[PDB]
Amino acid sequence: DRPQKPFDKFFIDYIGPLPPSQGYLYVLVVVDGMTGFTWLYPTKAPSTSATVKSLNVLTSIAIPKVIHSDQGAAFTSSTFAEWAKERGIHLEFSTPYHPQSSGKVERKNSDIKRLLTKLLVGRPTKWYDLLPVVQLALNNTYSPVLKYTPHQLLFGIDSNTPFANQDTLDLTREEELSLLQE
Amino acid sequence: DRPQKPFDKFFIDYIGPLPPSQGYLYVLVVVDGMTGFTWLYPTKAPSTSATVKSLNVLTSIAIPKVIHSDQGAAFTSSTFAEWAKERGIHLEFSTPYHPQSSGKVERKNSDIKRLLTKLLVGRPTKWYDLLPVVQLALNNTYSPVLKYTPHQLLFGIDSNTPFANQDTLDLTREEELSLLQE
Amino acid sequence: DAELDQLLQGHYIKGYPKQYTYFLEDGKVKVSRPEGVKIIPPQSDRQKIVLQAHNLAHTGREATLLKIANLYWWPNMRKDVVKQLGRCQQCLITNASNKASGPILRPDRPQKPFDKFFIDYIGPLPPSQGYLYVLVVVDGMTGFTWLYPTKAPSTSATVKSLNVLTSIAIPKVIHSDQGAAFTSSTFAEWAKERGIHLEFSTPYHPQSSGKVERKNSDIKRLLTKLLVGRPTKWYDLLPVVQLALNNTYSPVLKYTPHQLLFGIDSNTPFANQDTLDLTREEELSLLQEIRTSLYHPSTPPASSRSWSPVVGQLVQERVARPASLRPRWHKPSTVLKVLNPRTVVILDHLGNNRTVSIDNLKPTSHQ
Amino acid sequence: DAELDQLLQGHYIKGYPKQYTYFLEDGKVKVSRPEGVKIIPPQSDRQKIVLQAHNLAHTGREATLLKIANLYWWPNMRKDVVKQLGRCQQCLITNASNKASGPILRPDRPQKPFDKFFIDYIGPLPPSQGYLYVLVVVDGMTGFTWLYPTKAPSTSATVKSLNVLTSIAIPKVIHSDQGAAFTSSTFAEWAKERGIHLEFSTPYHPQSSGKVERKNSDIKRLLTKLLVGRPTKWYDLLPVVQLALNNTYSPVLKYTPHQLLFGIDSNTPFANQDTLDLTREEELSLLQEIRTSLYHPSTPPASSRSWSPVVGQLVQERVARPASLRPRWHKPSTVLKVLNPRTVVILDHLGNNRTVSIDNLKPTSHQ
DNA sequence: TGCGAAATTCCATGACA
DNA sequence: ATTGTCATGGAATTTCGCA
DNA sequence: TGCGAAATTCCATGACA
DNA sequence: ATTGTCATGGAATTTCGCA
Ligand SMILES: O=C(NCc1ccc(F)cc1F)c1c(O)c2c(CO)ccnc2n(O)c1=O
Ligand SMILES: O=C(NCc1ccc(F)cc1F)c1c(O)c2c(CO)ccnc2n(O)c1=O
Ligand SMILES: [Mg+2]
Ligand SMILES: [Mg+2]
Ligand SMILES: [Mg+2]
Ligand SMILES: [Mg+2]
Ligand SMILES: [Zn+2]
Ligand SMILES: [Zn+2]
């Protein structure tokens, strides 16, 4: 069988609704199944329109062979199906109520939901400006299985922003109190 | 002695006052003593100002060594003297009441006064437009003494406007009647 | 399809080398080439494939082929690639030429003064006494120059200035570019009344008026030097510059425009006095020989990849003032006549006959 | 005067050849030379004579000498002529150079992606969805290009676009020209906060940004072809062009900017499938060698009359936006340091240190 | 009949929107 | 139906002054 | 071991205001 | 303290298919 490659499969999902940050409420998460590279796009709704608008930016850089998602409404619409067919993208859906991706993708999506929470506390309405530095952190995180960061697997080079200092990724006792109040 | 050359001596004089043609009343006549070449400049007065203004046009093409004129007021002024000294032009005046130039210049000035009269009749207020074609005629007139036209002696070439047909230069009987009425 | 059918069983077809194994896989005829396994599409599908590869970025020969070669192979692929490039109207009118024009002509200097005038306008300049432009008239044989300040590059201002100039002599031919002042019917009537033939440069090719254009450079260069540290009052300097340039030596000619015109200096500083003992007839005799012995340059060597026009060839005229994001070249047109190796008549994109310089032409690529 | 006195009696003076008869006439020392009889002015009058001849039309060496030679002669006349030319401030700052710049440098391609970005603005363009400009960001190593439409070539629009770009990776160095958007202190602070070194081209030398400028040509060329026969709605085409150019083969490289960046094509038409059986680690290994073996051009041959800068030499910087009838060159200045054969630091005409390209310099004539 | 230096010629460079 | 041009200053070449 | 033709490479040309 | 670049298509060169 052919070895797994970048752009073979993109895993997409929505995170939200979130506190409004400059008008945006959701984050469309795109993860490459082979490298673990992550793209974060802020949208104003989990709609096909906002999904096509954000994926048009991504597909102007690289086009995946397959897009995998759950049976979310924005992804099972006939409009999004026509959008994927025009670009030669095969849509692949997980079973309803049985979300299935891959171990590397599952853990990657875990890190994103946890990293977003750790920085949402204290600045719940400023996460729009933080999305760039969040992507850099996620894509420069060392992978214990592959022993390479997503940046290294996608570009074949080291990065100018290595993240040697790891955030606790767990909420400190003071961050838990300031979160239960929100 | 050195042979006579163009630009050795310019003979200048005023003709007028004339009927007003587009605001001009006089004609400053400049004749090169060697070639007989003639320049005609219309002025509004026989003043030093109008003389300097018209000779500045001519001296931007060629500068004579000597300018000869009569004791006219515009030519004996201290202003015109300063003008000639700045350009290295030597002023030379004929005796008062004894106008003296040269045979070729005397006859040339005769032709100009006669040719102007022949075309003044019928169109006394349109001689301003005719000054170009008058200069061409004068400068392409065959010289019986030198057997060359002024144009040929100044440029060393034949002209694209040879004047083989000679005007009578005398007023026909009908032109004399239409002149005694003016 | 039928051609590919006999290839799978092992029969030879011209163009397909025999030493390769042609097989079938997934309903497509494939071949094991050194670069890898490629799909051999049927003849009826190859034009559409070349078009889809080209249309990605409207790429030239090699960049379009490198795309097709990633998936397909068939005999003489570049032949089909070039065939589509020559039919793509967008590439033909947008791409640049990679062939330079042939070497310039050095037309013979006019034999006599007033044989040919070159005229052109300089401007607009800083307002000086209400004047903005300068009419420049250069005699082709001598380089002698007349300067006339005008308020506009208009026909009326051109006629008024030339009526003053032609007081001294009438030229055979007046050469100018195709500016509005010189192409108007009013200016043509003015020239016909005086027996002057009007000659026009090919459009958008100031090299054809290079006689005046070069003189325009000297006029501006001197005006600049005289105006350093002063406000740009150039109106009163035009007679000064006219006299200065007309009496300036050309180092290659060893004469000034004034000397070539008159055969003798006037009462200007540093006037030459060599012919002082000669008569005027002897002086004019020497002048007539000096005019005929003047240095004349020859055509330079052609560049290594130049093109010369041929009757019937497909050429394209450059767009005059192309708008933003608009093609720089007109649609292809045919050369009707070759007036000289640098000038042709074409069947214009509107249906008219047009006389253009090859500097504003490119040969249509891919025939 | 005393030097000319001993010459009339027949005594020898160095510089004056003995085989000529030096005599006196009209109170002036004259000599019978082959060209004729010339006046030998005293040494104290020769500087004024050269000045009057030069100032007629501010002529160069030979044209000024041909004037003086009409009347005067003295030993080493051109030596005194050149001495005045080097002191005439008007000629030094108005005349053109006749020495070309040395051959261009071909700086090494950046070793890795994101080692050096080149950025520049395209515009203004026809209004499209309210947008007028395009931010072009080219990775120096790969040629991979990002396009961002903006309403102005402003720092604010530049930062907003680069914050989106740097979501994927942070570059070591960003190179740009000295436009207002990139030289503002706000942009410098933005780069310092992210550890990005800002590199700037020498002023008025777009060749130094030739990486993007060349990419700007391909962007406009493709946009033109896609907009033929259509109104210039280019806003919706920027993502199309960005993808098309990033996946276009460079015929000399044999790779696309996408392949040099990722080592593998994505789901684009005619995607290359050669490395299909390799693992990603084996694929990246091959990519690391492909990047190091890319073709690199060398410095071209110098032209026959080129000049290279030397420390202490007198050079002149070109005037940026010279007004009408104003000098094209600044006053002479001294080369302080030679960074490379094409770049120097000069003591600017205001007293500052300035880093300029030799393309905007000329060596001051006559030393 | 030849030398060193001055004088002359050569010509690449650039600018005429 | 029309067409490049020429000042400029270092460098290359020729000429000059003298023997 | 060499031929004719196809394939590849070479590179001058021009345009990025 | 900084530096030209590269798509393009005929032409020149190399390689291929075959013997
Ligand atoms: O571009 C012009 N010159 C520039 C120029 C370029 C090369 C050259 F070898 C000589 C030159 F002078 C130019 C024009 O484009 C022009 C037009 C068209 O706009 C109409 C009328 N006159 C014009 N003159 O006089 C011009 O000089
Ligand atoms: O003249 C420009 N290009 C033209 C150009 C010329 C030669 C070359 F090899 C590449 C080129 F692109 C140009 C500018 O003059 C400019 C200025 C100055 O006005 C400020 C900011 N950007 C600028 N860009 O981007 C430009 O391209
Ligand atoms: Mg013009
Ligand atoms: Mg012009
Ligand atoms: Mg720029
Ligand atoms: Mg630019
Ligand atoms: Zn095309
Ligand atoms: Zn000067």
Distance CA A10, CA A59 (A): 11
Give yes or no for a cis peptide into B42 (omega within 30° of 0).
Answer: no
Q: Which sequence spans correspond to the domains of chain A?
A: 1-182
D59 touches chain C (CB under 8 A): yes
Total residue length of chain C: 367
**How many whole angstroms separate alpha carbon D267 and alpha carbon D273?**
11
CB atoms within 10 A of CB D356: 22
In terms of Cα–Cα distance, which of C164, C172, C176, C109 is closest to C142?
C109
C-alpha to C-alpha distance for D67 and D53, rounded to whole angstroms: 6
Cis amide bond preceding B46, omega within 30: no
Q: Give the integer Cα–Cα distance in Å for C37 and D338.
A: 55
The alpha carbon dihedral of C5, C11, C17, C21 has a sign of positive
Which of D244, D245, D325 comes nearest C126 by C-beta?
Answer: D325
Asked whether the beta carbons of residue A5 and residue D280 sit closer than 8 angstroms, the reply is yes
Q: Which two tokens stand for residue A137?
A: 């952190």
| Strand-by-strand arrangement of the C22-25 sheet | C22-25, C28-33, C36-39
Q: Which of residues 139-158 of C touch strand F (CB under 7 A)?
A: 143
Residue linked to tokens 């001197």: C222
Return the ligand number nearest the Cα of D81: 8
Which secondary structure element, helix H or strand E, spans residue D291, and what is its range?
A: helix D280-292
Tokens at C79, concatenated: 């032949």
Is the distance between the Cβ of D107 and the closest atom of strand G smaller than 7 Å?
no
Q: What are the φ and ψ backbone dihedral angles of D255, each rounded to 5 degrees?
A: -145, 160
**Positive or negative torsion for Cα D70, D73, D79, D80:** negative
Return the SS3 of C333.
strand
**CB-based burial, C198-236: b 16+ in 10 Å, e otherwise:** eebbbbbbeebbebbbebbebbbbbbbbbbeeeebebee
Element (H, E) at D257: helix D257-262
What's the CA gap between A18 and C195, in Å, rounded?
A: 88
For residue C194, CA distances in Å to A8, A38, A91, A100, B142 come to: 82, 82, 83, 95, 21
Q: How many CB atoms lie within 10 A of CB B167?
A: 11
Longest CA–CA separation in chain D, Å:
104
Question: Is D317 close to ligand 2, i.e. is its CB under 6 Å away?
Answer: no
Cis peptide, bond prior to residue A42, ω within 30 of zero = no
Closest CA to A114 of A47, A165, A179: A179
* Nearby residues of A111 by Cβ (< 8 Å), 6 or more positions away: A138, A141, A169
Q: What is the dihedral of CA A144, A145, A146, A152, to 10 degrees?
A: -30
Q: How far apart are CA C80 and CA C17, in angstroms?
A: 18
Question: What is residue C98's three-state secondary structure?
Answer: coil
CA angle, residues B82, B86, B87, in degrees to nearest 5: 125
Give the three-class secondary structure for C90.
Answer: helix
Instruction: Protein contacts on strand E: list nucleotides below 7 Å from a Cβ.
Output: 6-17
**Residues C318-335: b if buried by 16+ CB within 10 A, e if exposed:** bbeeeeebebbbbebbeb
Span from the CA of D90 to the centroid of ligand 8 (angstroms)? 5
Name the percent of chain C in helix, strand, coil, to the closest 5. Answer: 35, 20, 45
Residue B71 identity: Q
Look at residues C76, C68, C70 and name the one whose alpha carbon lies nearest to residue C14.
C76
Closest by CA to C189, choosing from C227, C155, C216, is C155
Q: Quick one: which of C339, C293, C295, C333 has its CA closest to C317?
A: C333
Experimental method for this entry? X-ray
Residue whose CA lies closest to nucleotide G6 C1': C76
What would the two tokens of residue D106 be?
């071909």
Contacts 24+ apart (CB under 8 A), D300-305: D300/D103, D300/D104, D301/D103, D302/D102, D302/D103, D303/D100, D303/D103, D305/D98, D305/D99, D305/D100
Half-sphere exposure of D67 (CA within 13 A, CB side): 25
The resolution, in Å, is 2.6
Q: Which of D28, C274, D29 is nearest to D20 (CA)?
A: D29
C-alpha to C-alpha distance for D9 and C19, rounded to whole angstroms: 104
Residues 6+ apart with CB under 8 A from A173: none
Q: Which residues does D347 contact at the CB level (< 8 Å), separation at least 6?
A: D333, D334, D336, D353
Contact C213 CB / ligand 1 (< 6 Å)? yes
Residues 6+ apart with CB under 8 A from C298: C106
Helix B48-58 × helix B78-86 angle, to 10°: 20
Query: Is there an atom of ligand 2 within 6 Å of D239 CB?
Result: no
Is beta strand D306-307 parallel, antiparallel or unpaired with respect to D100-101? parallel
- Angstrom CA distances, B175 to B109, B170, D56, D165, D331, stand at 22, 9, 52, 93, 70
Residue C115: DSSP 8-state: S
Eight-state DSSP code of residue D143: -
Secondary structure of chain A in the HEC alphabet? Answer: CCCCCCCCEEEEEEECCCCCECCECEEEEEEECCCCCEEEEEECCCCHHHHHHHHHHHCCCCCCCEEEECCCHHHHCHHHHHHHHHCCCEEEECECCECCCCHHHHHHHHHHHHHHHHHHCCCCCCHHHHHHHHHHHHHCCCCCCCCCCHHHHHHCCCCCCCCCCCCCCCCCHHHHHHHHCC
To which residue do tokens 């059918």 refer?
Answer: C5
Residues 6 or more apart whose CB falls under 8 angstroms from that of A115 comprise A134, A137, A138, A167, A169
Contact C328, C322 (CB under 8 A): yes
**């030319």: which residue's tokens?**
D85
From D105, D181, D106, select the one nearest D137 (Cα to Cα): D181
**Environment class of B64 (CB within 10 Å of its CB; exposed 0-12, middle 13-18, buried 19+):** buried
Euclidean distance between CA atoms D52 and D46, whole angstroms: 10
C-beta atoms surrounding B88 within 10 Å: 13
- Distance, angstroms, CA D348 to C1' G13? 37
CB of C107 lies under 7 Å from some atom of strand F: yes
Q: In a 3-state reduction of DSSP, which class is residue C64?
A: helix
CA D359 → C1' F15, Å? Answer: 38
What's the Cα-to-Cα distance from D364 to each of C222, C225, D332, D343, rounded to whole Å?
19, 16, 7, 17
CA A133 vs CA A163, C199, D184, D255: distances in Å: 11, 69, 24, 31
Q: Tokens in use for C116?
A: 């040919």
Return left, alpha or beta for D297; rule: phi > 0 is left, psi -120 to 50 is alpha, else beta.
Answer: beta
Give the residue from B119, B131, B98, B101 showing the smallest Cα distance to B28. Answer: B131
What DSSP element (H or E) covers C220? helix C210-226
The SS3 of residue D55 is helix
Phi, psi torsion values for D221, nearest 5 degrees: -65, -40
- Alpha-carbon distance values, D248 to A6, A57, A96, D243 (Å): 19, 19, 41, 9
Q: Quote the tokens at residue C326.
A: 């608009």
Hey, how many other C-beta atoms are within 10 angstroms of the C-beta on C153?
20
Distances (CA, A) of A122 to A133, A176, D352: 17, 11, 49
Identify whether the C-beta of residue A11 lies closer than 8 Å to the C-beta of residue D257.
no
Residues belonging to the binding site of D are 115, 177
Which string of DSSP letters, residue by residue, matches C134-181? Answer: EEEEEETTT--EEEEEESSS-HHHHHHHHHHHTTT---SEEEE-S-HH
CA distance C364 to C332: 7
Nearest to C280 among B3, B132, B159 (CB): B3
- The closest alpha carbon to A154, from B8, C51, D186, D114, belongs to D114
User: In 3-state terms, what secondary structure has residue C49?
Assistant: helix
Is residue C151 within 8 A of residue C130, CB to CB? The reply is: yes
Q: Is B13 annotated as a binding residue?
A: no
Pairing of strands D173-176, D197-200: parallel
Give the orientation angle of helix C43-55 with respect to helix C61-68, to 10 degrees.
120
| Sequential DSSP letters for C193-207 | HTT-EEEEPPTT-GG
Residue D109 CB-half CA count within 13 A: 19
Max Cα-Cα span within chain C:
104
**DSSP assigned state of C263:** S
Round and report the angstrom distance from CA (C78) to C1' (G5): 14
CA distance B21 to B124: 8
- Please count the other Cβ atoms lying within 10 Å of the Cβ belonging to residue C43: 13
Spatial separation of the C-alpha atoms in residues D262 and D113, rounded to whole Å: 10
Classify C39 as helix, strand or coil. Answer: strand
Task: Give kind and range of the element (H or E) at residue D53.
Answer: helix D43-55
Q: What CA–CA distance (Å, rounded) separates B133 from D192?
A: 78
How does DSSP assign chain B, residue by residue?
-PPP-TTSEEEEEEE-----BTTB-EEEEEEETTT--EEEEEESSSSHHHHHHHHHHHTTT---SEEEE-S-HHHHSHHHHHHHHHTTPEEEEPBTTB----HHHHHHHHHHHHHHHHHHSS-TT-HHHHHHHHHHHHHTSPPTTTSS-HHHHHHSS--SS---SPP--S--HHHHHHHHT-
Left (φ > 0), alpha (ψ -120 to 50) or beta: where does D366 sit?
A: left
CA pair distance C54, A90, nearest whole angstrom:
25
User: Tokens for D237?
Assistant: 């085409």
What is the atom index within ligand 2 of the atom nearest the CA of D121? 25
Question: Residue C238: which H helix or E strand, with range?
Answer: helix C238-246
Handedness of CA A161, A166, A168, A170 (dihedral sign): positive
Residue A174 to residue B11: CA distance in whole angstroms: 111
Taking alpha carbons only, the member of D185, D181, D177 closest to residue D162 is D181
Distance CA A42, CA B92 (A): 96
Asked if residues C241 and C233 have their Cβ atoms less than 8 Å apart, the reply is no
Give contacts of C 257-286 with D, CB under 8 A. Answer: 269-274
